[PDB]
Structures are given as structure tokens and as C-alpha cells.
Design a protein around this ligand. Structure first.
Ligand SMILES: NCCCC[C@@](N)(CC[C@](N)(CCCCN)C(=O)O)C(=O)O
Ligand SMILES: NCCCC[C@@](N)(CC[C@](N)(CCCCN)C(=O)O)C(=O)O
Ligand SMILES: NCCCC[C@@](N)(CC[C@](N)(CCCCN)C(=O)O)C(=O)O
Ligand SMILES: NCCCC[C@@](N)(CC[C@](N)(CCCCN)C(=O)O)C(=O)O
Lengths: 297, 296, 296, 295
């Protein structure tokens, strides 16, 4: 039996104001997540622009998430991934010592480690701390794939590695994982297919869409865990169009644009190489947003 | 719309000395019927459509119809082609010879546009008045029937009622049923039968059911009964055989497994298909042991 | 090892009122001959092999043979099929009716293994005594003839002399000619004709040459003369027309282009192939204005 | 100005976890003595991801100082997926004597074409040395489209070409048919000759770490339009060129260097590690077909 972080989770956006992390806005957005039934938040994942933050800013967002969730049931699953194991270890230890409840750790991007290397990477991380570690597979961004064999071996050799966030659009893989290792927590990292992953025994989502519609994502997720599949599928079907349009340009470009258009953040700011969407996609995002009910603060 | 749904088997076609073993074909079909299968699909990809002549294709349809005649089991006849005149000819034969419906694969090799796909299927649909199921398998055809095309055909042609999806794309299944929840989405990919049914799919056209018809039919009927727990359990237990049956191109592994089970007399294909590599042969034999294979 | 190499044209098949326009077919071939082409390829992918009947296919081969008879232009007949018995039949017909060699596409749709591909081509190569050229186009067929398999066939079969590559994989072309520099590698991809030739390829089987036979054959011969500057220059100039001819699936744009140029009477295909969109019709027409197109 | 010809994506040797600086210098001298035109410190092959910014800076200084009294140029690895980090590296390389920079497309965060354009524009405007774009979609999860490369070439004076490692010869044709003024550089050893025969003007090689004499000969034969001799060497090199990617680069090349006695220890920084026993033997077998120059 392992310690786990599951349920509806939000891959938090990181709002910028004048190039700087807007810390008060960050906390406010987290409280809005908490108030709308979210079970955990993920500071500084892909959606949080982990690549363009400094290590110090990355750490600051984690503290803000811990502090804001303190005295609530909401857990902090801190973004702690890196393509350098020594950097990933550093983030894990910080997350550990500053009260994060677990870490999300993306597969190394760019340097394309072998399955053996991925094993050693995660093993080194998992042994550096005693908090839950969620693996994170997203081959379209990293250029590598953590195989099912490798994921299962890590779950079985490391006590704190408890599951994987899958963003590979491969439901066959999801069946493979849970058929051979039914003990692991399979987490959806692809909004459009939240329901199918939950209906196969997935235990949560780490969502982009929940930044905008946290009430609907947590409802979907909780319906599924309660085996009310008709209601979970209904929301998933409703959410399909926005779930897709939030990726008309690379995430987090559309979600931030949507949060801006909704009046949830003050400034539509990115750090290069990320930038505003074309005026066309701006209109498309405005188009889909208007078809949903968006919570305020 | 009239439909054919539930648990269906994409029947293998047994050869003896290069010729279609008619008696064995009929016996294999009776075995499917006795194990609670709802429909059989003669001459699909699994039935080696490519290497049968038009005469043998027609004969296989006839045996299927006649074998299922006095039963509740329906015949969804394999009727696709990459040439529209051939496909229409097949469709009209199937209609006139007692098939309950037709399965019609997307044209392979010639890569039609979406407009061409539309006209292809519209031509087929207007040639018969029995249900037509579309069939998407881009990994084999080199073309994809898009979601929009599928939906237009479903809405424009009364007898077109759904699609067999073999694309390994659960996102598309969600896309399909969220925009047109009236269509019958049929699983053409055994390993993910359950996920497709749990999103509102209404049946399977299965390779694995040639070997394990009772388990595939049970899986499907649990799902249709909203007993997802039982359906998922079976889908998980079947994952090993489901995948190993595609260690080489279908239907190489399934015919190999049917042979190892003693269900067919000879492991015979028509070129360019041939028996599997000996490594894969052993993998198939080892996996089969985990399962209980019904006899005749 | 007898070979057919140089500048070759994958001939379009003109239709008039649903039928093969045989007079127009012969006229287009004579145009090819008169513009420096070394060989024509009747009924390949470009020739809509999939929608022709076997009788129509055989007719087109005979017309090409007859038209080329008294010239030095060779007929490399399209004789491919996804069914080995069909491909053997086409191969034998081609030999018996005066074809100089055969092109034989890899089996589409049924995805045979490398072992299956070996036996498929070995059967074909042993059925006749004329040169056989292999044809790799994985985007259309869904299978790939591995370098190892191509090389075995080249070494095991006397009359198999090379491959037409339409895979966009220059790495593979390096692999082939590094390990077997005796085989004839043929470009089946116009846009990269020059890079394939400059690595030691000995010809092309072209779509573009239907419209611009003089430029393609000049390119090829410049390359064979090791005048690489001149070959690359033509290749770069042709890049735009080479790409626009694939804005929709081949041969939809090439036939549209021939119609625009006044080279065929009607813009007819056979379903599932159809007319291009007005937009793509305009793109092709726009691009065509940059090039000198040979008359009748 | 431009930096072209035969170039080497330098491996970075480690000893006891630390960059072996003396070994790094000897390896560069060895490249210089074997006819190489330029070296590329800290590219993908040099484990850019796992070096700290400080160590990355040190490797650049060593390359510049080692090359200083020679004709060999230093094209400094200066890429990043964060534009601010990339501008920092670019400025450092300029200020510390680099002749130009190599800048890989942002990895992981997948910028749009507009973002890639602004990324490189910000970099190009920060220094007045040549910049070579670097496209490797299989590693970065994004591609610099032909249009974007061409706009950057045309809009930015010091952006002069692209290292292409995308296994797409159609792209190479596209690029040079529309903009033949750019320096297309091969970043894929197996197809060095095809890229050069199409108007490419150099290579940035993995294989040249082990066999610099052969890579520089191939490149110079090609540049002198002796395609016969260039293809001959490209063909001879095919086995080693492929085997050096039997596992992710630079895992096989470092293994090869170690087996050859060109580096002291087979040491990577996680998440990179030693190859499987099976691939270790394969690499060892292929190496026996080639003559490896010493120091
Ligand atoms: N189901 C029985 C018929 C099999 C026919 C065929 N082997 C070939 C189909 C064909 N359209 C025939 C063209 C023959 C003339 N070139 C094709 O090969 O594309 C196929 O459909 O795979
Ligand atoms: N004035 C010169 C006549 C040359 C004849 C022919 N066109 C071939 C004609 C041929 N296809 C040959 C068939 C024999 C193949 N070994 C034919 O006679 O039909 C050629 O070889 O180029
Ligand atoms: N979340 C805060 C840290 C961000 C760091 C970095 N931008 C780059 C990481 C790095 N390993 C740094 C290498 C520096 C020396 N070249 C990389 O660029 O790969 C990333 O991980 O995306
Ligand atoms: N005695 C003649 C040697 C020439 C020096 C240098 N190695 C490079 C020079 C440089 N790297 C600085 C060049 C600045 C580039 N814009 C150096 O001074 O070390 C070269 O030009 O090749």
C-alpha cells in the first residue's frame, strides 16, 4: 500500500505581470480552485510554464501553493520534473522540505534517455525523498516514451512511485498499465479523454481545462469515481470542444488567453519562446469560451 | 435506422490445399453461434478478402447466411473494395443473397479524398436497402474517414448506421459520439473493446472471438447491460491474447492460434500472407495456455 | 542482369464517358517518346490501377507495348497486386504480350511480413524471365519492403534488378546502395529525384513527366552524365510543380494539370477518385504558368 | 560572415562527476590536427542538458582558447528552451571569443512558429556574431518550418543557415530551392553526402569525434565537387554512422571514444547512462572496420 494523490487536479497556469510572477493572483487562482471542489493543485507543470521560470521562481510558486492549501484537504503535487537528474532531485528535495504532499516528474525532454536511463533517473529521484512521486509521460513534448514495462518496474522497485500521468492519447497503453499493475494510479493528462481513462480504472486527472472550469472537471472526476458513468460521460462530451480548442496552439497559450478573456488574470503575458496566439485563434478561443459557464472568484 | 450491433466475429477463412474449406468454414460459424455471438462478418480483413477471388468471396457470404439462417445470429457481410464499382457489386450480391447488412472498408492504396470517400459510400448505400457499416482502418488503407465525413454519411444516407473503428484513437470515438450520439460505434480493435463500449459503443467486430467467442460475447453483453465492472475484468484478462494476436499482421496470429487449438486442420494462408515467425509462433502458443478454449 | 533505367513516366489513364480512352492513351505515349523519355509505365498508381478491371489493365499494357514497339522506348508494365496469384497473372500476361519488364508494387492493405514479401516477389520473379522492378510506397500500402528484403531478393532472384522508392527516406537509399551498389535504385518521388540520382540512383519513374517529360528526362540524363549542377538546377526549378501535383492524392492533380494544358479531353476519374476542389484546381493552374509545357 | 565545412559536435568527457577539462582540450587539439574546420562545444552531443550554465560556459572558453592560434572556428552551443537563458549563453559566447553560435529550437515547451521567430530574433539581436539555427524535431517536439527558417534568414543579418537533423531530404530541397543563399548544414551523419550533393556547405558531425580525418575528407571532397570520392566515404561510413545511434546520442559515441582509448572513463550524467551489453558489443564490432587516429 502506497501514499497517493488522486482525484480532480489542476495544472495551474502561472500568471505574469510585467514579466514577473504575479504572486497574489497565483494564490487567488488557487483559492478559486479550492472553492470549486478540486482535490489537488499542480504548481509549475507544463501548463505552468516550467521551462521559462527560474529555479527560484519555480520554488516560489510551490511555496505559494502549499501555503494557500494549508489547513485545507487540498494536496499540492509539485511540478518537479527536469531533463537533468541532478536538477530533478533538487526540486524533489525542496518540495519535500517545504511541505508539498507529492511531486509530478516529467520524463526528461530533449536528451532522449533510454528505458534504462529513465529507470535510473526516476529511481534516483524516488530515493531522494519519501513523498509520493507521479510519473509523467508526454512523448509529443519530450521526444521519449516511458514504456509500460519501465513504468511498472519503477512502481514495483520504488515504494513512493505510485502512478503515471498519461498524455499520449493511447488508450491501449492505459489498458496495458492497469491490466498488469492494477495497484497503480493512472492519471489522465489529456482532458478530451478524461472520461475514458477514468472508466478504465483511472483514479484522477491533472487538467488544463480546470483552470477555466474547475467545477465541471471536479464534477466529471467525482461522478466517475462514484461509478456514475452516465453523468461523467455527459460532462466529458459537453467539454469536448473546449478540451480540444485549448490546444489550437501549444498549451498553455490558449488556456491563459481564455483566463484573460474571462477576467481571471490581469495580463495576457507569456515568456518567450511562448507568445500570444494569432488574432484568428484569439477569436476561436473567445468563440468556444462563450458556450460555457465560467466561475468567478 | 435498422442496425446490427452486439458481439460480432470477423470470421477467419480456412484453406485446404489452397482452396476454401467450405465444411470447416460452416463448422467454425456454428461454433460461434453456440457461444452467444450476435453476428458474424464473413470476408473482412480477418477473412483474407484481398486474396479471395470475387467468386470465393461470394461463396463465403452464402455459407454464412445459410448457416445462420434458422438462428437469431445476423450476417454483416464483408463487402468493401478500393474500387467503387467492385464495392457496389459486392453490396448488391450480399443484399440479394440474404445478408442482413454489409461492412464496407475504406478504399485502400488509392487514397481517396474526403469528397471521394463520401461519394464512394453514397454510391454503395444507394445500391442496397440493408444497413451499411463503415469501416475505418487507416493503418492498412493509407486513408482516414474523418469524423465529419462519417457524420455526414450517417445523416445523409438512411441505411448507413455507424462505423467499425480500428484506429487506436479513443479521442476520435469521443468526438464521434459527442457530436452524433445516434450512430453505432463498433469496436474493431479487441484490446480496447471495453473503453469503446464504456463511452457508448454498441458492439465489437472481433478477431479474438474466433478463438474465445464466449468471453468476447460475455464482455460485450456485460457492457451493454452497464455492468462495466464485469466488462472491464474480462477486457483486462483478455489483454495478453488480444495483443499477441497482433504480434504479426492479422490474421496470421489468429489462424495460427486456431490451428494450435485444433479448430482448423492446417495453417494455410494465401500469399503474400504466410505462417508467422517461429519466435512469434512460440509466443502465441504460450499465451493461449492461459485461456480456456471452447471446442465444437 | 538485364535492366530498364533512365527517365520513365508513370502514365495517367485518361477516361472518356467512364471508359478507357485508348486513342488518347496512345497519343500521350507518343508525346512521351518524342520528349526524350526512356521508358513508360502503364497502369501504375498514377494510372489508377485499382479502379481498372483486369481486362482494362491488360489493354493499357498492350497499347503501350504496340505504341513503343518500333522505338527504343521500353515498356515497364504495371503488374502489382496485393494478391500474389493476381500479380503473377499480370506478370505472365505482360511477358506474353511483349512487355520489356514489370513494375510490381508491394501488397497493399493486407500488410504481409518481410517473409511474405520475399515469397510474394520470388513467386512473381520466377513466373517470368523479364526484368522485375520492386516498388516501395509505404504511405499507400501500409507496409514497407525492408532494405534486407530488397537486397535478398536482388541476390536470390536473377531478374529482380532494383526498386522504385517512394518513401521519402534518403537514409534508406544510402543503406541500399552502400550494401548493394549493383542494384538499380529508382526514384518514385519527383521532388527528390536529384538527391536519389546523385547518390547513385539510375533513373526515375515520374508523375511530373506526364506534363513535363522534357525537363524530367533532361534532369535524369544530366545526372547520369554526372553533370550534377545541371540536374540539381532543374530539380530545384521543378520543386513547386513537383509538390503542387500532390495537393490532393495522385493522380488527381496530374490529370487536372493535363486537362488544363489541353492534353486530355475530359477531367474524369473513377470513384473513389474524383475531381479536385475548385481551390486546388486554381492552385495547379496558378503553378502551371511558371513552366514551359510541351504540346502534342 | 559564416562558419561552414567539416565541424565536430564535441563530446564532453566526465571524470568523477566533473568535466575533465584537460581531456576536453586534448580532444579538441586532436580535431584540429585532423583537418576539422570548426568545433561545436556543448551541443546535444556534448550533454548540454546536464551541464550547469557555469560548466557550459567553461567548455566554451576552453574551445575558444584551444583554437585561438589556429584556423579552426568555435561555433558555440548556445541553445535553450527559455529565450532569456538562450540570450545569456549567446552574449557569453560573443563576449568570450566564440566565432558564432549554434542555437537549437526550444524543446519541451513547443512554441508556435511566431514564437520560434521571436525567440531567434531576440537571440540574433543580442550579439553581432553569426547564428546557425538547429532543427531536430525528434528531440524538441517542434519543427522550425521552412517558411520560418527562410524569414529568419532574410530578416536577420547574422542568421546564416540551419543545421538540419530531421531525416527529411525533401525539406533540404525545399529550403535550398527557395533560398539557396543559406548555409544548410548536415546534422545527420548517415546522410552527410546527400545533403552536400544538394548544396549543403558543411556538417556538424557526431562521427567526427571518433573519425575526424574521414569526415573532413568527405566534406572537402564534396565541397571540391569530387562527389565520387565523397560518396565513397559516405558509403564506407554508413555502418558506424548508424551504429552510433543504436541508442540515443551521445551514448554510443562516448562508448566508442572510451573503447578507443580517447577518454579515460565511460561516464555520463543521468538521465544518460551506459548502453546495453548487447549494443556495447555491436559498437565494438563496427569500430574494428575503421582506423581510429590517436593524439
Ligand atoms: N474480395 C475479393 C476481391 C479482391 C480484389 C483485390 N485483391 C484487388 C482489387 C483491385 N481493385 C483490383 C484491380 C485489378 C486491376 N489492376 C486492386 O488491386 O486495387 C482486393 O480488393 O484486395
Ligand atoms: N527498332 C528497334 C526495336 C526495339 C524494340 C523494343 N522497343 C522492344 C519491343 C518489344 N517490347 C520487345 C519485347 C521483347 C523483350 N525481351 C516488342 O517486340 O513488343 C526495345 O527493345 O526497345
Ligand atoms: N523549472 C526551472 C528550470 C528551467 C530550466 C530549463 N529551462 C532548462 C534546463 C536545462 N537542463 C538547463 C541546462 C543548462 C546548461 N546548458 C536544459 O536547458 O536542458 C528547463 O528545464 O526547461
Ligand atoms: N592569429 C589568427 C587566429 C585567428 C583566431 C580565430 N581562431 C578566432 C578568433 C577569436 N575566436 C575571436 C573571433 C571573434 C568572432 N567574431 C579569438 O580571438 O579567440 C580565427 O579567426 O579562426
Amino acid at each position: 500500500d502506497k501514499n497517493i494523490i488522486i482525484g480532480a487536479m489542476t495544472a495551474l497556469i502561472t500568471p505574469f505581470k510585467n514579466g514577473k510572477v504575479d504572486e497574489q493572483s497565483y494564490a487567488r487562482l488557487i483559492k478559486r480552485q479550492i472553492e470549486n471542489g478540486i482535490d489537488a493543485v499542480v504548481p509549475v507543470g507544463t501548463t505552468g510554464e516550467s521551462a521559462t521560470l527560474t529555479h527560484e521562481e519555480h520554488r516560489t510558486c510551490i511555496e505559494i501553493a502549499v501555503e494557500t492549501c494549508k489547513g485545507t484537504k487540498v494536496k499540492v503535487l509539485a511540478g518537479a520534473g527536469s531533463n537533468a537528474t541532478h536538477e530533478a532531485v533538487g526540486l524533489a528535495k525542496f518540495a519535500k522540505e517545504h511541505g508539498a504532499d507529492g511531486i509530478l516528474s516529467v520524463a526528461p525532454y530533449y536528451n532522449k534517455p533510454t528505458q534504462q536511463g529513465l529507470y535510473e533517473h526516476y529511481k534516483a529521484i524516488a530515493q531522494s525523498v519519501d513523498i509520493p512521486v507521479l510519473l509523467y509521460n508526454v512523448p509529443g513534448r519530450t521526444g521519449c516514451e516511458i514504456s509500460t514495462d519501465t513504468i511498472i518496474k519503477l512502481f514495483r522497485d520504488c515504494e513512493n512511485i505510485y502512478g503515471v500521468k498519461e498524455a499520449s492519447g493511447n488508450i491501449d497503453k492505459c489498458v496495458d498499465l492497469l491490466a498488469h499493475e492494477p495497484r497503480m494510479m493512472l492519471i489522465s493528462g489529456e482532458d478530451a479523454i478524461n472520461y475514458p481513462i477514468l472508466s478504465n480504472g483511472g483514479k484522477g486527472v491533472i487538467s488544463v481545462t480546470s483552470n477555466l472550469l474547475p467545477d465541471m472537471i471536479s464534477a466529471l472526476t467525482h461522478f466517475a469515481l462514484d461509478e456514475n458513468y452516465k453523468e461523467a460521460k455527459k460532462i466529458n462530451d459537453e467539454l469536448y470542444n473546449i478540451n480540444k480548442i485549448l490546444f489550437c496552439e501549444s498549451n498553455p497559450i490558449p488556456i491563459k488567453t481564455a483566463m484573460y478573456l474571462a477576467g481571471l488574470i490581469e495580463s495576457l503575458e507569456f515568456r518567450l519562446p511562448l507568445c500570444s496566439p494569432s488574432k484568428e485563434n484569439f477569436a476561436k478561443i473567445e468563440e468556444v469560451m462563450k458556450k460555457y459557464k465560467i466561475k468567478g472568484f
